[PDB]
Structures are given as structure tokens and as C-alpha cells.
Amino acid sequence: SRRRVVITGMGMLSPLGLDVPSSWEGILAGRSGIAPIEHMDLSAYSTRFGGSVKGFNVEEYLSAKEARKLDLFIQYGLAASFQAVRDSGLEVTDANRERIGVSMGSGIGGLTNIENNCRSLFEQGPRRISPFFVPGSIINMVSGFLSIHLGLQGPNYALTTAQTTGTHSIGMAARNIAYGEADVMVAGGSEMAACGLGLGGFGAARALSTRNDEPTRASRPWDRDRDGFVLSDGSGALVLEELEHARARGARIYAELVGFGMSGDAFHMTAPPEDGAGAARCMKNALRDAGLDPRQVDYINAHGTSTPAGDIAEIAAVKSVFGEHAHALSMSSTKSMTGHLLGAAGAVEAIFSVLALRDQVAPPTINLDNPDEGCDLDLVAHEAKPRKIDVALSNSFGFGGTNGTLVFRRFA
Amino acid sequence: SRRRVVITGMGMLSPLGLDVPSSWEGILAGRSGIAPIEHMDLSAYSTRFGGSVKGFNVEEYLSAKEARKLDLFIQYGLAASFQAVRDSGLEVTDANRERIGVSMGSGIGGLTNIENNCRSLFEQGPRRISPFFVPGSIINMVSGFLSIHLGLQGPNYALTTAQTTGTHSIGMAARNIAYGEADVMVAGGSEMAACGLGLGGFGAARALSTRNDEPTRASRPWDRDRDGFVLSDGSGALVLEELEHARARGARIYAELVGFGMSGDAFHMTAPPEDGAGAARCMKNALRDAGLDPRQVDYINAHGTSTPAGDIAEIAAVKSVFGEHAHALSMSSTKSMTGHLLGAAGAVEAIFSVLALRDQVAPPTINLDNPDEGCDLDLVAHEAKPRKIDVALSNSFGFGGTNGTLVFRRFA
Ligand SMILES: C[C@H](O)CNCc1ccc2c(c1)OCO2
Numbered sequence: 001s002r003r004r005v006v007i008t009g010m011g012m013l014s015p016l017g018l019d020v021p022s023s024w025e026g027i028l029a030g031r032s033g034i035a036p037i038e039h040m041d042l043s044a045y046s047t048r049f050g051g052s053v054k055g056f057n058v059e060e061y062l063s064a065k066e067a068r069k070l071d072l073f074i075q076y077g078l079a080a081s082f083q084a085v086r087d088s089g090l091e092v093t094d095a096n097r098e099r100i101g102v103s104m105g106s107g108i109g110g111l112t113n114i115e116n117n118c119r120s121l122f123e124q125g126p127r128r129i130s131p132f133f134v135p136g137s138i139i140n141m142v143s144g145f146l147s148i149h150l151g152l153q154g155p156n157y158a159l160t161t162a163q164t165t166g167t168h169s170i171g172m173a174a175r176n177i178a179y180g181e182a183d184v185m186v187a188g189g190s191e192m193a194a195c196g197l198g199l200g201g202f203g204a205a206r207a208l209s210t211r212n213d214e215p216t217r218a219s220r221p222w223d224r225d226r227d228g229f230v231l232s233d234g235s236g237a238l239v240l241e242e243l244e245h246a247r248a249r250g251a252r253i254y255a256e257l258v259g260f261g262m263s264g265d266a267f268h269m270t271a272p273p274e275d276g277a278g279a280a281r282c283m284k285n286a287l288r289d290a291g292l293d294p295r296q297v298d299y300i301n302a303h304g305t306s307t308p309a310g311d312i313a314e315i316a317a318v319k320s321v322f323g324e325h326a327h328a329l330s331m332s333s334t335k336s337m338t339g340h341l342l343g344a345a346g347a348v349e350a351i352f353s354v355l356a357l358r359d360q361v362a363p364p365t366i367n368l369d370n371p372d373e374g375c376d377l378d379l380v381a382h383e384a385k386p387r388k389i390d391v392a393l394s395n396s397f398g399f400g401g402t403n404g405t406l407v408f409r410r411f412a
Numbered sequence: 413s414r415r416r417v418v419i420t421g422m423g424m425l426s427p428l429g430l431d432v433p434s435s436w437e438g439i440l441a442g443r444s445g446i447a448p449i450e451h452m453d454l455s456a457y458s459t460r461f462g463g464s465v466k467g468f469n470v471e472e473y474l475s476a477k478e479a480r481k482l483d484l485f486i487q488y489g490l491a492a493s494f495q496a497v498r499d500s501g502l503e504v505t506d507a508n509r510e511r512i513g514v515s516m517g518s519g520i521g522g523l524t525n526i527e528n529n530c531r532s533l534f535e536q537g538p539r540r541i542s543p544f545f546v547p548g549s550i551i552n553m554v555s556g557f558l559s560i561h562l563g564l565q566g567p568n569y570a571l572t573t574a575q576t577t578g579t580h581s582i583g584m585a586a587r588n589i590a591y592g593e594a595d596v597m598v599a600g601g602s603e604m605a606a607c608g609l610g611l612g613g614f615g616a617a618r619a620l621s622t623r624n625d626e627p628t629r630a631s632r633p634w635d636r637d638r639d640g641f642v643l644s645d646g647s648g649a650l651v652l653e654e655l656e657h658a659r660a661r662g663a664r665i666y667a668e669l670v671g672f673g674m675s676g677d678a679f680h681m682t683a684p685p686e687d688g689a690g691a692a693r694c695m696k697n698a699l700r701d702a703g704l705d706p707r708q709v710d711y712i713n714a715h716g717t718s719t720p721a722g723d724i725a726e727i728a729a730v731k732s733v734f735g736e737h738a739h740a741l742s743m744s745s746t747k748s749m750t751g752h753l754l755g756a757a758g759a760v761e762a763i764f765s766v767l768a769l770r771d772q773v774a775p776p777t778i779n780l781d782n783p784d785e786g787c788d789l790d791l792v793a794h795e796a797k798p799r800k801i802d803v804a805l806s807n808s809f810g811f812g813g814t815n816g817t818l819v820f821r822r823f824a
Contacts, residue, residue, distance in 0.1 A: 111526075121608050127616075148678055156814040156815075168569055266559045401559060
């Protein structure tokens with residue numbers, strides 16, 4: 001019968017820091033991690049900026065000889081996974097290695113690597129393709145390499161649900177523990193889609209902010225002057241753990257994961273419904289899953305991508321789910337500061353949601369200078385808001401109409 | 413407790429046929445789907461053959477315009493999925509659409525699209541990248557497009573666990589129904605990696621059979637002259653359904669899904685341990701899940717890729733799990749005929765496991781002319797074997813040491 005699940009460890013690479021504490025300080029101070037991109041020439045692109053991971057040293061984690069074989073998304077995933085495990089204090093042994101699994105996902109995976117090998121193929125021939133092209137690019141290799149390095153023999157898999165990946169990864173890993181398939185799961189996601197095909201591809205679809213001359217003000221969720229999402233890189237990993245297993249070993253518990261919802265919009269390949277019907281279904285699923293009155297919700301970490309249709313759909317979903325309580329809770333998009341980490345988005349945002357519970361503060365939506373028509377909720381414009389948070393909700397919505405909601409609460 | 417899960421619809425594209433009955437007819441006849449790859453310059457490549465889908469007409473399923481938006485792997489997953497839903501007789505209504513979800517996966521995803529858009533990028537610049545590049549290439553768009561075309565609002569996700577994808581997709585879909593999160597799921601996998609990058613990428617790891625003189629003899633699982641796997645394309649989809657839901661509408665039930673096992677080798681990035689310790693834990697996990705003794709297993713559809721180390725590890729794993737019953741069961745590799753459909757391998761081989769139960773026949777391992785050292789099990793060499801089959805296992809063991817096992821049982 002269904003077991004309870006707590007968070008005992010967290011790790012992160014974001015545009016704001018090379019770990020959780022440093023990233024979280026940036027969040028609470030309203031700092032942007034968005035800057036013109038330096039790792040390639042974007043003069044022929046309509047978008048020339050994003051949230052890069054700055055000064056990442058893979059040799060804090062791996063040998064240069066292994067690192068070279070792996071796409072950045074995998075390096076980022078392992079760094080965050082390693083951080084989360086260290087932060088948990090958990091020791092892998094013969095007694096428990098079979099009860100510890102990993103579900104680290106990505107939206108796009110090794111696009112940089114696949115592009116580079118495509119270039120080698122087209123310009124030089126097939127004999128210049130890396131022998132590591134497949135194990136070093138495909139999405140399940142975060143879960144793979146983590147299990148090899150730590151000796152994790154539990155359930156080993158990866159989700160790819162586009163911008164919903166990190167939320168789904170975390171939610172399903174909690175279901176694994178809930179149902180007895182595992183006692184511990186390392187779950188989240190990683191993304192590094194800032195190559196030509198990534199920036200070009202979102203560019204072709206006219207989905208990205210083109211504010212090349214003011215990159216820190218580009219991501220402006222619910223602002224009337226928003227013009228698309230900002231593309232960001234990084235990783236989030238959490239250690240999820242059966243409550244009694246955590247209690248038995250005296251683990252520090254950050255929070256309890258009480259709720260998980262999924263739904264499909266069945267509306268459009270890329271556009272959300274204007275009324276947020278799919279998001280409303282998903283949140284209601286998650287709150288029912290948690291046994292909650294919707295009035296218990298204090299804080300929502302919105303998807304909040306800074307697209308015209310996405311942002312407004314979310315307001316509608318929250319108003320429809322929470323009614324008059326929609327006016328009492330605080331909702332913010334940390335994408336105002338981090339940008340959109342795509343498949344890692346749900347992962348870093350689940351960490352920020354937990355930290356909102358630990359520190360009792362709503363992170364700000366920076367750049368919200370003129371809230372758009374109907375965007376009249378407490379969106380924590382400009383500045384972090386200290387406040388009572390017992391229950392925090394993290395939303396994600398992706399291409400394919402795929403929706404995810406996580407529900408966290410304080411644990412005593 | 414836990415709801416029972418049955419199979420009420422199946423769909424398929426394979427190198428043997430454009431649907432299930434044509435593919436199954438090839439399987440039982442021991443026909444090969446392997447041939448030199450056409451309309452593609454493989455001159456500089458060490459492998460020139462594989463299992464292509466022959467004569468696929470996407471306009472039976474989609475308009476020309478919607479198909480132009482989608483990678484072949486997505487077209488193949490939609491084909492299989494529409495066939496499976498149609499095969500099931502299911503009527504989607506307002507009253508049930510929130511209880512019907514999708515989990516269709518891929519191991520490698522949109523390489524053909526990535527290649528063609530790379531061509532554009534390098535030759536002409538980013539502004540020639542297709543607007544539909546991203547949503548038309550990402551792995552969750554089979555689940556996404558299927559849910560939109562049919563109005564499915566239940567759990568909407570996609571696994572990517574390399575060569576284990578289709579096994580995990582079906583297993584986790586069965587969990588969703590068992591634990592009351594859905595009444596119906598469409599689950600499986602699709603793959604189209606018979607492009608330059610797939611053939612070049614795997615060719616660079618020297619993972620592929622190079623037997624160009626005799627493509628139909630290349631895939632020879634457990635044969636002492638095997639020299640690696642054969643790369644193949646296609647899709648499988650099953651309609652999974654809660655038993656009482658299936659009985660109430662009078663569904664035709666092919667078989668019951670009674671068990672799902674997962675495990676990680678925690679061994680190596682591409683190589684299994686020699687003793688198959690991980691495949692052994694996974695099969696034991698699947699049998700415990702089913703509440704079955706190893707002695708009750710009649711038929712195993714092996715992973716059986718035709719890699720030197722893979723085939724021998726699976727022999728060790730079965731001998732370890734099944735002790736004195738290991739010779740009594742029949743075990744065959746349908747990859748001897750289909751090749752390795754990678755992420756779709758577990759989907760089509762689940763379908764072949766279900767039809768082995770319906771038709772009481774173990775499919776052959778063709779090309780098994782000279783079993784290797786220790787390959788002395790009943791591997792159904794050369795020809796189909798009619799026999800009693802109450803319980804059938806389908807195994808998938810993929811890169812990152814990720815293992816999957818499904819247990820099916822006759823329903824009457
Ligand atoms: C780090 C580097 O970008 C990887 N190789 C790409 C690359 C390969 C071959 C080429 C080329 C470019 O221009 C002409 O022939």
C-alpha cells in the first residue's frame with residue numbers, strides 16, 4: 001500500500017550557479033543569469049542570448065577522458081545527480097543498491113553532439129563519427145552513467161516529455177517509491193540545447209524572445225511586452241526516499257512530495273489552450289492525489305515561460321482551479337531569472353519550490369513592469385516576498401499538450 | 413491491491429510487414445526482413461543493409477501536410493498506435509477520455525530530421541531550418557500527436573531507455589492502469605535510425621554486423637559466427653486495458669500482462685556483465701511481480717541482438733534464474749528475422765510474445781547453424797515449434813545497463 005516520499009537531497013547547475021545554494025541566492029536577490037551567448041557565433045540567428053552554465057568544471061565530477069565522450073546535457077545531469085546524492089548523506093551498499101534507481105530525463109538530449117557528428121559525417125565521411133556518438137548522446141545515459149558510477153541497481157529509466165520532462169521524471173520516481181518498486185530514486189532532468197539546431201529550430205518557430213539588445217529583460221512572464229521564452233541550460237536532481245527509510249537512517253528531510261498530476265491537453269502540438277483547461281485538469285489531479293483543499297496552496301512556481309499564450313493560459317488555469325483563493329496564494333516564474341531550461345525546467349523549479357518551503361519565501365517574477373490583461377494575481381513582481389508557505393505547487397506544460405504538477409508540503 | 417491489465421489491441425510496422433498479421437506470418441515462416449538499404453549512398457559505410465519498413469503509406473493515417481511535419485520515427489509510432497486503437501474497438505467519449513493515456517517511446521528519436529535540418533543549417537544558414545524541426549523531431553510527439561488526434565486526456569508521456577524503451581513503455585503503462593491512474597493506455601515504441609547517423613554511429617562502435625555479402629544471414633543470435641546486431645526500423649503499439657473495463661464493453665482479449673521487471677546492471681555503458689547478473693535480477697523481479705515461480709515460464713522472447721557478449725549473458729541469466737527448468741522453456745530471438753528495432757524492439761517482441769500465447773507456437777531463431785559454447789538451451793533453431801505456452805517473457809537489455817522484462821499469461 002502507498003508509501004510516503006520525502007526529499008533528502010538536491011543538486012543543480014543553472015544560469016545562476018554551479019550548485020543549489022548559489023543558484024537560490026540569485027533567485028532570492030532577483031538576479032538574471034541571461035547574457036549574450038559566447039560559446040558560438042550567433043550573428044546569423046534572430047536570438048543571440050540565453051542562460052548558459054558559467055564556469056562549469058566537469059573535473060569536479062569526472063575524468064577529462066570520460067567527460068570528452070559525453071554531451072554537455074549528460075555532464076550537467078551527472079553533476080546535479082552527484083550533488084543530490086552527496087547532499088542526501090546516503091551510502092550505497094550491497095544491502096540497498098537494488099532498492100536505489102535513477103530517472104533523469106531530457107527534452108532534446110545530445111543535440112550539440114549529434115550536430116557535431118553530423119558536421120563530421122557531411123564534410124569528412126562516416127569514418128569521422130565518434131565511436132561514443134550513441135552512448136554519449138542518447139537521453140537515457142544520465143541514468144546509465146549515474147548507475148555505473150554509484151552502483152545503483154534499482155529501476156533505471158529516462159522520460160522525454162519536452163518542457164515537462166523534469167516534473168514527470170520527479171513525479172513518476174515518487175510513484176516508484178510510493179508503490180514499493182524502489183526505496184530511493186535520483187530524479188530530475190538536464191538540458192543543453194544551445195547549439196545551431198536548437199537556437200535555429202526554436203528560432204524557425206518564432207518561439208524565442210529576440211530582445212538581443214537587453215537579454216536580462218527578455219524573460220518577462222505575464223508582462224505585456226513579452227515576446228517568447230529564453231533558452232537556458234543546466235540540470236536539477238533530487239533524492240526521493242520512502243519516509244520510513246529516511247527516518248531509519250536519520251536523514252535530513254527538506255519536504256514531503258504529497259501530490260503528482262499529469263494530464264494531456266489533446267489541443268495542439270505546441271500551443272496551450274487559451275483557457276488553460278489541460279493545466280486545470282492536471283493541478284486538480286495533483287491536489288486530489290495530495291488529499292488537499294485547494295485553499296491549502298500557499299505558493300505556485302508557475303511554468304511561466306514568457307510566451308503570450310502560455311502565460312495567460314496559466315492565469316486562467318489557476319483562477320479556474322482556486323477561485324477566490326487564486327487571489328490569496330503567491331505565484332511566480334523563476335524563468336524571469338533562469339530562463340527556460342526545457343526538460344531541466346521542472347527539476348530546478350521543483351528545487352526552488354522545496355527551498356520556498358524551507359525558507360518561507362516566495363521567489364520574485366523579475367521584469368513584471370506591466371502585468372498583461374487579466375494577470376491580476378499576486379505574481380510577486382520584482383522582489384522576493386517572505387510569507388507562510390505550508391504547501392507549494394510546481395507546474396510544467398510541454399509540446400504535445402503534456403502537463404505535470406508536483407505538490408510539496410513542509411514535513412515535521 | 414491492484415487492478416488486472418489485459419491486451420485488447422495491437423499495431424505494428426516491421427521489416428516483415430505493414431501490420432501485425434503480415435509480420436507474424438513472416439516470423440512463423442522464418443522469413444528475414446533484412447536487405448541492403450535503398451535510396452541512400454552507403455558506399456563509405458562498413459554496413460550497407462538492415463531491416464527497412466517496405467511500402468509504408470503514411471497517407472493511410474495522416475494528410476500529406478501533417479506527415480511533412482513529422483520525423484519517420486513519429487509517423488511509424490502513429491501508424492502502430494492507430495492500428496492498435498482500431499484493433500481494440502475502443503470508443504473514446506467525453507465520459508472516458510480522461511482515463512485514456514499514451515506512452516509511446518523511442519531510443520534515438522529524430523535522426524533523419526536532424527540530418528536533413530543539419531544539411532540546411534551548414535549549407536544555407538539557420539533561417540532554412542524548418543519551423544516544425546523541434547515538435548516534429550522530439551520523442552514525446554508520438555504520444556502528443558496521438559492524444560491530439562484521438563482526444564486522449566489521460567497520462568501523456570514518453571520513455572527513452574535505448575534498446576529497452578518499448579519494454580519499459582508497456583510495463584510503466586501497465587502500472588498506470590494497475591494503480592488506477594488510467595483505464596486504457598496506448599504503449600510501445602518506434603524507431604528509424606537507418607540513416608547515416610544511425611549506421612555511422614553504431615558502425616563507429618563496431619557494434620553492427622558487417623556481413624554485406626549475405627544480409628539475411630547477418631542476424632544469427634547465439635551462433636558462433638555472429639559479428640554484431642542488424643539495425644532495423646518500425647513500431648509496435650499495444651492497447652493496455654483494465655480487465656473489468658475490457659469485459660464490460662465485450663473486448664477481444666489477446667492475453668493478460670501479469671508481471672513487469674526493471675533493473676540496472678550498474679556495469680558498463682554498452683556491454684552487459686558476462687554472467688547477465690542484471691538480466692537475472694530483472695527476470696526474478698518480473699516473476700515476483702507476477703507472483704509466479706520460474707518453473708511456470710514456457711516461452712522467452714530473448715533480447716537476442718547477435719552481439720558476442722549480449723547473447724552469452726542472456727544464456728547465463730536464464731540458466732541462473734530457471735535452474736533445472738532452463739532447458740524445458742523455449743527461448744528464441746525474433747531479431748534473427750526482424751533485426752534490432754532498438755527502442756521499438758520491446759514493443760514488436762511483446763506483440764510476438766502475445767501471439768505465441770494465442771497460437772501456442774515458439775517463433776524460430778533462424779541462422780542458428782552452430783550454437784556457440786554453452787548455447788545448449790532450446791533456442792528453437794531454424795523453424796517454428798508448436799508447444800504448450802501458458803506464460804511468456806519478453807526481455808530487453810540496453811545501453812546504460814537498463815533491463816526490462818514483461819510477463820504475459822494466457823487469458824480464458
Ligand atoms: C569541434 C568541431 O566543431 C567538431 N567538428 C566539426 C567539423 C567537422 C568537419 C568539418 C567541419 C567542421 O568543417 C569542415 O569539415
